[PDB]
Amino acid sequence: KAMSARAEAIKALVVSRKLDRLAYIAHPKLGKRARARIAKGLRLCRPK
Amino acid sequence: PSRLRKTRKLRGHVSHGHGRIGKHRKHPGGRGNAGGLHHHRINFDKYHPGYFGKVGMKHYHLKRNQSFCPTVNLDKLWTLVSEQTRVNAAKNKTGAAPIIDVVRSGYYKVLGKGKLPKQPVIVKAKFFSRRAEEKIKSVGGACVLVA
Amino acid sequence: SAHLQWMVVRNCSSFLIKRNKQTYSTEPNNLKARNSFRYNGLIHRKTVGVEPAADGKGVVVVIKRRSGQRKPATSYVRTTINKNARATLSSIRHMIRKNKYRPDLRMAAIRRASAILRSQKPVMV
Amino acid sequence: NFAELKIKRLRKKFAQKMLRKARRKLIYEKAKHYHKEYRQMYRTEIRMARMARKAGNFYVPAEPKLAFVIRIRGINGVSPKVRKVLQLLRLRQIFNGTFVKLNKASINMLRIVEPYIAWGYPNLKSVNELIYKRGYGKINKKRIALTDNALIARSLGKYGIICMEDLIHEIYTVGKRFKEANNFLWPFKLSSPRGGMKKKTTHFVEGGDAGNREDQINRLIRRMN
Amino acid sequence: TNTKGKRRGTRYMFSRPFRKHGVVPLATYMRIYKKGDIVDIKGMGTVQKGMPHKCYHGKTGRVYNVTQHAVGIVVNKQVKGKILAKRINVRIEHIKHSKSRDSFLKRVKENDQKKKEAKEKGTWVQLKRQPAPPREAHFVRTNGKEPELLEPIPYEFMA
Amino acid sequence: GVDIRHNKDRKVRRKEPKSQDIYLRLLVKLYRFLARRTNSTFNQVVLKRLFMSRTNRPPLSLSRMIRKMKLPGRENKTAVVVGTITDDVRVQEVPKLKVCALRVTSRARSRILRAGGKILTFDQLALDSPKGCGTVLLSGPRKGREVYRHFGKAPGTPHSHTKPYVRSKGRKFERARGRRASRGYKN
RNA sequence: CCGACCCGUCUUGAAACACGGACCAAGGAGUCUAACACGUGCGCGAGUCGGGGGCUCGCACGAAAGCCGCCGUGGCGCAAUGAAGGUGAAGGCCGGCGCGCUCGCCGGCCGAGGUGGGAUCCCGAGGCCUCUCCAGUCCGCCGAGGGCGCACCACCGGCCCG
Ligand SMILES: [Mg+2]
Ligand SMILES: [Mg+2]
Ligand SMILES: [Mg+2]
Ligand SMILES: [Mg+2]
Ligand SMILES: [Mg+2]
Ligand SMILES: [Mg+2]
Ligand SMILES: [Mg+2]
Ligand SMILES: [Mg+2]
Ligand SMILES: [Mg+2]
Ligand SMILES: [Mg+2]
Ligand SMILES: [Mg+2]
Ligand SMILES: [Mg+2]
Ligand SMILES: [Mg+2]
Ligand SMILES: [Mg+2]
Ligand SMILES: [Mg+2]
Ligand SMILES: [Mg+2]
Ligand SMILES: [Mg+2]
Ligand SMILES: [Mg+2]
Ligand SMILES: [Mg+2]
Ligand SMILES: [Mg+2]
After folding, report:
1. What's the superkingdom here (chain D)?
2. Which of B116, D142, D213, F118 is 20 to 30 A removed from D50 (C-alpha atoms)?
């Protein structure tokens, strides 16, 4: 009777920073799309 | 095997595993159990308490066969009979409890260590214990005596 | 089994020779004559060995058949190859690689075959 | 299927190569930032004292917090208290070197072994020469030469140290994980000081070599390694 | 050589402090002791009953038993090369609460609240007590006053 | 030189079975490879326990193993013991047990198989669960040997309950002085 | 050229003004038995052991090996405690009644208890995947937490005997 009394209270709800950016890119998971984007920008060339 | 001992490995060493200083004399500190009360009092008292003195009644011409009374516990009770014996009585609807003679198997007193299976069984023995008789009577078995 | 027999005779066999910090074995079907589980010629279900022919020309390639694992009279099949060197090595390589009969012994048997074949040309002074 | 699995592996290797490129560029820039940080401190210390002399007052520099301790005496005839402190400083041989973070506790410990050690306050250059030349990482209870940046990353990347420059910054400026960084380093096995010591059995202030020499440890380091 | 008496060489140890004779103050008898608390064995010489031995004088132990007029204390006594935990029955006059443990509980109650309070309003706060750090850089003024020159005094024969 | 203490440099531990049994060594060869080339620590525990002596591999009574198996959350799990399984004549209802062991008593073996159990050697267990998945690693009583009764403090010391060494048991053998207050002391 | 005293032995201390040793060859000193204790190896396993005896062509080997089973007498272990008369090792849970009186007769289950550690095992939130996405099948890997807990340790209980 104390567990259920506690339980209902639990469910009573509803700049660039270049160095910091570079570490984010170097993160093996966080920067996967980041380094992928610059990789395709190194090979593909398009005007405008 | 001679080749497996310290003697074959202690060649060339002058003390031969007994020290340059104290050496290996004939019998230091007496022979046998010498000085159990004077200079080996510590060792005798440390490892063998009760060693010195007399306790109790001396009994002349003790015959061990008179006191011969092998014991058996309740947990080992059903091992005296065949495996077929227990299952046949277990499955029987009639209350036919089997007869077990521990004297036949070589026991005179039935002790009451452990718990018995839930089925009646008749025990014949020269002696019982209060708890062994209690446990046997609890499961529907009866206790009889032999001489 | 192969391993079970090996542990029995890894150090207790008549073919075993131990001298001058070396170990050698002299069973008839041993390539390189060294005492090892891989190169033992009697404990495996399938073995291959190269020996000189009865005369001083050609070699004899002997193999173990899959049925006679307990009948030594018919346990082995022998044949004699007495062609040129390059063709002779090809047959031994083909009987090992293409047949997939203990492929690890490919180069070992060929080297032993090379030693035997060169041991039959006349000696020089 | 050969081309399909080949394409799969080429995608693997190219991504790994790009990741190494990303890691190298981070290493390059972090070293660049440290060089900016180093010259900031050097100019600031001068500038702080310069304005004091203009104002007519004095500027006391901060009490130095990094010390390098070198065992100078042998192991024969050492009292147990001195021996225990030396083992806590990982100086189990003559001419061993280690970095000690300075505080009340460490200073009193150095006081006990004052006859047996010679210690001072290394500058930036002294730290650079020690780590690059005599740097050995105690990896998996083994003394491994620090020949690549990857070895530091395998054991200190959780603390953010991934390059030799990162290690130098943590050693020089006492960082959050100085204890993990310094304990990771194998104790420095320095040579005998070329040119000879003055006298090892007496304190430096009395003309010998033991005890504390504030900035003169840099002179001793250059001859030692 | 030395006598094996229980109270040998305790002439000053069990002696009362100067001008501290007389009736024992009754605060000591009004102390309340539990199990697991930490006490320091003093060993006053006013009352000779329940006197701790000289080897336990000044040592520190933890209470495990309580009686009408004494407590049982577990104390680590060093013998030769080994330390083993002795149990001694000592009357309450010879002990007192260890102020070290009381301050330790004082810090812990302060520390747990600080974690509770700072987490509630957001900030991060230091819990571990660092040792004394090196003194940071600071300026020292002169206020138009020169530092006073100090010269070693010439020696003269004092007496 | 350096100031290090060499007395503890060589760790005193087993590396290989002292026995010359080829069958034991063969399955040691198997699990040595298993311990090296897998991640499951269950292989290492089995591997290092194969090096252990007979006294360090005590027999496991059938009653004790059944008691552990009957514990909740262990159903349909393969019991594993590195040693000898021993029959107990103090139990009657033998449940179905899938058990791997180095050695099983024949009367223990017959009871288990008659009760519907399954017996696998250690080589078969490796083919069954190479990672040791779904296994219960039991052991016999290490301190259940008689020699541990004598081990401990000296019998003459106070608060000692160790068995002294006596050639015979009786009222005349080590019961008088030091064992009763009527003679000297009792300690 | 540099370094270098004659060994063995007793000793805190030997090159000693300490004893033994002229040289050479051969011989020469921790063995066997019994009883213990521990460790290790093997077989069997709550049983183990034929060692005494007997049985097999009387015997080169073989004075060996093999077998006994109503030859297991017996030894050791499977029960201890007491001087002795003697006695002698199972409780956990759920119900009605006296009075659930610190309580006895039963009924039902289960079978050596509980606490804290405890390798190992199990469940497991959630993550790792491909040229991609909403669309979902198969198993593999990493893993916060949770559970059963081997042996063993420490403590609390419980039972046996005086
Ligand atoms: Mg020696
Ligand atoms: Mg002496
Ligand atoms: Mg006397
Ligand atoms: Mg010296
Ligand atoms: Mg020079
Ligand atoms: Mg000195
Ligand atoms: Mg050395
Ligand atoms: Mg040494
Ligand atoms: Mg001598
Ligand atoms: Mg002498
Ligand atoms: Mg003298
Ligand atoms: Mg002289
Ligand atoms: Mg003499
Ligand atoms: Mg002479
Ligand atoms: Mg001779
Ligand atoms: Mg015979
Ligand atoms: Mg009998
Ligand atoms: Mg006997
Ligand atoms: Mg526990
Ligand atoms: Mg108790």
Report:
1. Eukaryota
2. D213
Q: Which two tokens stand for residue D139?
A: 């990896």
Gap between the Cα atoms of F69 and D74, Å rounded: 62
Method by which this entry was solved: cryo-EM
The partner residues of D67 in beta bridges, in order of sequence, read D100
Residue E152 burial by Cβ neighbours in a 10 Å radius (0-12, 13-18, 19+): exposed
| Closest C-alpha among D19, D8, D27 to residue D164 | D27
Q: Give the closest-approach CA distance of E11 to chain D in angstroms.
A: 33
Contacts of F23 in chain C (CB under 8 A): 4
Single-letter amino acid, residue D142: K
Tokens at residue F95, please? 């449940």
Residues 6+ apart with CB under 8 A from D14: A39
**F178 closest CB neighbour out of B50, B79, B114:** B50
Q: Do chains A and B touch (3 or more CB pairs under 8 A)?
A: no
The sign of the dihedral angle between the CA atoms of B36, B40, B41, B43 is negative
Resolution in A: 3.6
Q: How far is the CA of B11 from the C1' of G28 (A)?
A: 14
CA of D14 to C1' of G66 (A): 78
Residue carrying the six token digits 């496991």: F60
| CB pair distance less than 8 Å for B79 and F89 | yes
For testing the chain E interface, which of D47, D60, D101, D106 should be mutated: the one with the most E CBs within 10 Å?
Answer: D60
Structure tokens that stand for D18 in this block: 């790009």
Type of residue numbered B41 = R
Based on the number of CB atoms within 10 Å of its own CB, is F132 exposed (0-12), middle (13-18) or buried (19 or more)? Answer: buried
Which residues 170-209 of D have a C-beta within 8 angstroms of F?
Answer: none
How far, in Å, CA of F77 to CA of F63, rounded?
17
Which chains are adjacent to chain E, needing at least 3 Cβ pairs under 8 Å?
A: D
Q: Distance, in angstroms, between B105 CA and closest chain F CA?
A: 16
| Residue F76 vs residues B125, F107, F128, F136: alpha-carbon distances, Å | 44, 23, 14, 10
Nearest one of D140, D181, D187 to D164, comparing CA atoms: D181
- In our burial notation (b when 16+ CB lie closer than 10 A, e otherwise), range C69-104 reads eeeeeeebeeeebeeeeeebbeebeebbeeeeebee
Written as six digits, the tokens of E145 are 């006053």
Enclosing H/E stretch for C19: strand C16-19
Tokens 């010390």, residue located: D67
By DSSP bridging, strand B109-110 and strand B127-128 are parallel
Helix (H, G, I), strand (E, B) or coil at F60: strand
Distance from CA of C48 to the nearest CA of F (A): 25
Report CB contact under 8 Å: F26, C4. Answer: yes
Instruction: Tell me the residue length of chain F.
Output: 187
Do E36 and E74 meet the contact criterion of CB atoms below 8 Å apart? no
Q: Is E80 on the interface with D (CB under 8 A)?
A: no
**Which ranges in C1-125 belong to alpha helices (H)?**
2-9, 85-96, 106-118
Which chain F residue lies closest to C6 (C-alpha atoms)? F22
D180: CB partners within 8 A, 6+ apart: D156, D159
Distance between start and end Cα atoms, chain A: 70
Pick the ligand that lies closest to the CA of residue B22: 2
- Confirm if F101 and F78 have CB atoms less than 8 A apart: no
